Design a binder for this molecule. Structure first.
Ligand SMILES: CC(C)C1=CC2=CC(=O)[C@H]3C(C)(C)CCC[C@]3(C)C2=C(O)C1=O
Ligand SMILES: CC(C)C1=CC2=CC(=O)[C@H]3C(C)(C)CCC[C@]3(C)C2=C(O)C1=O
Ligand SMILES: CC(C)C1=CC2=CC(=O)[C@H]3C(C)(C)CCC[C@]3(C)C2=C(O)C1=O
Ligand SMILES: CC(C)C1=CC2=CC(=O)[C@H]3C(C)(C)CCC[C@]3(C)C2=C(O)C1=O
Lengths: 330, 330
């Protein structure tokens, strides 16, 4: 609830600590400052918070220090996210994000944002070392952040092969595979995995078990994001949807294609152009195949299945850690 | 000499090992394959080799495995270098490199190269873990590669502030500071530092001492690169120079500015435009201030000073490790 406020207030310190007794390079550190402030503030903080919330839920040993290390690693997750978005926005030619102008679209930034994004990545490891250098799960954390990065990158590769800016490539299997690698791992496993390691919980099986739960949650959450992109109330969301315009391998086109011949063709002409003549065409076709109802039915089945997953795979972790996230996404 | 051949022949295995039993994502792994092959082969391999050469020189315990770990970490250095160049080329709008067409200029790559470059970064840590996960200097290696990345990025930031694509900013202090961070750390300290850790040599002081030697060597080597850019025989080099065209904070303009008023002005009009009317203008002005002779004299003083550095800072490491590099750059 309000806990999010306490997490954002810790951003000040994060930036202090990453910005300093070699004065040769101050101009660069100022620039880093600006990059962090533009690019790590603005969102909803759910992934960073998840680290903190999951840490409280998972430990007994909660000294002022122990906590600080939590809001730091949370901020690391946020930093990894900023690195990806800054880079994704360039790769996509996006205009806005959070809706401010994308960092790279700022006059005088342009493609320098590639280096800025790499700096954001690097700040992860500077933080870990600053706060996470004496603890025993230090190495475990570094490895997790690196593995999460790699997965996310592989997924982005997959995405960019699948959806260069042709519908044979939009399969279920491809779609699930993009979501798992591009989104689910860093969005759902990373934050909890990280709380796990902070809380002493380092076993392969526990992590695997948690992984199984969290990737499925990830899958649903991105499917819901795709549904809501088109059929969400724009002011319950704070957006209007452009998945269709952008030739995106959305879950709605996967399912539409599974249920199309002369509607295949109708999708050819209208998926991935810019005027709401042609967005209207597909939306309305989605309505005609009852994708909303397919979605309702998926959300019901998917929830059933997450709960079965929790019953089965959670112990000896507190089910609450997984149920907290579930309540929030569903 | 020929040892370089044995290092390149180990690239095959490197790629094998980074390219595989999750078939959902093969299209992505193929793409990684292509990125590695285009972007890590082509250069002169000096930094990767330096790891291997320095490892042999520094250890007694050289089993088939011990060696393999050397040519791997060498390849890691090469991978870090590829990551930087791919990204630098985009940031610069370069046309060629190694002179093949820059990766990003390939039809169908474009700004997807940003993700490709991140993949190259990630492959560093995948390799370390594959070969460097049981050894005791594992963590030490990860930290070194991360620190080297950060330094290089900070330097690139500095460079991009200094030389956006105005001469008040071209100072000596700024120039030395760009070179140290952008070039010298990853080019000269990383490879040797890395051999050091592989060879058990992990003390703060030894590394600091080696650092002191190697950064100075780095400084000279980039100064020589700047001199040779304009005044090198183009066919002893395999290039012709465009430092001037590109508004670069070269060492030649630093020194030119230190020795200019109505020649300051003459530098204003002619530094950073594209026709060899105006490159001729500055070159010839460099000749008139005897920058070649200033350079000769610097190279003499700089060599004197490296040797003093070695005499003083090398022990208990074999001076040869530093002298080998010196002979080669000077
Ligand atoms: C940095 C910022 C824009 C930011 C973006 C977010 C993108 C999402 O996909 C969000 C939703 C999942 C739709 C809802 C909340 C969490 C996500 C991941 C999110 C942020 O938390 C966020 O700070
Ligand atoms: C500030 C408070 C209302 C609050 C709202 C949230 C909105 C959501 O939609 C939840 C989801 C994005 C669906 C899942 C993550 C948590 C979200 C963002 C959420 C909060 O945590 C939250 O505290
Ligand atoms: C990947 C490839 C182009 C590559 C580029 C190199 C750039 C340099 O600055 C080279 C010089 C220092 C001028 C001479 C040899 C070493 C350098 C760093 C170098 C490579 O080894 C190299 O493979
Ligand atoms: C293949 C052999 C001749 C060989 C040539 C080299 C050329 C050089 O200019 C040396 C410098 C780039 C100046 C310093 C690094 C080593 C260089 C590239 C070098 C070799 O190591 C080398 O084996």
């Amino acid at each position: 609830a309000q806990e999010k406020q306490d997490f954002v207030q810790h951003f000040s310190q994060i930036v202090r600590v990453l910005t300093e007794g070699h004065p040769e390079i101050g101009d660069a550190i100022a620039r880093l400052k600006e990059v962090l402030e533009y690019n790590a503030i603005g969102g909803k903080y759910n992934r960073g918070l998840t680290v903190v919330v999951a840490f409280r839920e998972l430990v007994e040993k909660q000294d002022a220090d122990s906590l600080q290390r939590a809001w730091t690693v949370g901020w690391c997750v946020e930093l990894l996210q900023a690195f990806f978005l800054v880079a994704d926005d360039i790769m996509d030619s996006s205009l806005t994000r959070r809706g401010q102008i994308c960092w790279y679209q700022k006059p005088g930034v342009g493609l320098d944002a590639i280096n800025d994004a790499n700096l954001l990545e690097a700040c992860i490891y500077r933080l870990l070392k600053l706060y996470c250098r004496e603890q025993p799960y230090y190495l475990n954390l570094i490895e997790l952040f690196l593995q999460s990065s790699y997965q996310t990158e592989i997924g982005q590769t997959l995405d960019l092969l699948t959806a260069p800016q042709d519908l044979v490539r939009f399969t279920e299997k491809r779609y699930k595979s993009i979501v798992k690698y591009k989104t689910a791992f860093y969005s759902f496993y990373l934050p909890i995995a990280a709380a796990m390691y902070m809380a002493g919980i380092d076993g392969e099986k526990e992590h695997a078990n948690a992984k199984k739960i969290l990737l499925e949650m990830g899958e649903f959450f991105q499917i819901q994001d795709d549904y809501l992109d088109l059929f969400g109330d724009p002011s319950v969301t704070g957006k209007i949807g452009t998945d269709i315009q952008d030739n995106k391998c959305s879950w709605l086109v996967v399912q539409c294609l599974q249920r199309a011949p002369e509607q295949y063709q109708i999708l050819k002409e209208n998926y991935g152009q810019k005027e709401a003549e042609k967005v209207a065409r597909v939306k309305a076709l989605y309505e005609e195949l009852d994708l909303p109802a397919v979605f309702l039915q998926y959300e019901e089945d998917s929830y059933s299945h997450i709960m079965a997953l929790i019953e089965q795979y959670a112990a000896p972790l507190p089910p609450a850690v997984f149920l907290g996230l579930a309540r929030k996404i569903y």
